[PDB]
């Protein structure tokens, strides 16, 4: 919930998909079975300048409103104790409680 944490997710997501996350021709095409030329280093040369703010592997992939690393689920965008309070309040399309 920390201001700095919730802004730290923002400062990462504003640029990750704005940068090498899509600017990825130097990601996989360079890293192949091609010549053992400078390419093997040229891969790391760009990444040494690149921040670890921008990499698909980096971000926690959590909720947005909370700022909490846990409770988030991939399909929703919200943490557990908020998404359930909206769920059984009704604000999830077609989501209800059944049994077997």
């Amino acid at each position: 919930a920390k201001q700095s944490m919730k802004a730290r997710e923002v400062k990462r997501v504003a640029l990750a998909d704005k940068y090498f996350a899509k600017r990825a021709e130097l990601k996989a095409i360079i890293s192949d079975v091609n010549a053992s030329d400078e390419d093997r280093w040229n891969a790391v040369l760009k990444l040494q300048t690149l921040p670890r703010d921008s990499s698909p592997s980096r971000q926690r992939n959590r909720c947005r409103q909370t700022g909490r690393p846990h409770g988030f689920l991939r399909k929703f965008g919200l943490s557990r104790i908020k998404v359930r309070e909206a769920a059984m309040r009704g604000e999830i399309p077609g989501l209800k409680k059944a049994s077997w």
Partner: protein, 98 residues
């Protein structure tokens, strides 16, 4: 020619969403094929209602998404002219695929 594949939540909603498709296509639309049950997926999982404590407290939430086929077989023009820009029984999803 119009393979109609509609997907919706409720069986008492998709029935009243298919009623209009299957009614308009007989008065105009030349002997559509028919509706098939087309079994469905319900997305059954157990989501953590858990607060900081008491893991043993759980929730078993689902979303029942119904699946149905129509497959208007003939390439009749009045079919598309009756099925240009209509959406009924909001809470569903319909499409017109040739």
């Amino acid at each position: 020619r119009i393979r109609i594949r509609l997907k919706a939540f409720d069986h008492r909603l998709i029935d009243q969403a298919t009623a209009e498709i299957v009614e308009t296509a007989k008065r105009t639309g030349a002997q559509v094929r028919g509706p098939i049950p087309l079994p469905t997926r319900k997305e059954r999982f157990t989501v953590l209602i858990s607060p900081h404590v008491n893991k043993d407290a759980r929730d078993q939430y689902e979303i029942r998404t119904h699946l149905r086929l129509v497959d208007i077989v003939e390439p009749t023009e009045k079919t598309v002219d009756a099925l240009m820009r209509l959406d009924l029984a909001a809470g569903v999803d319909v499409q017109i695929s040739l």
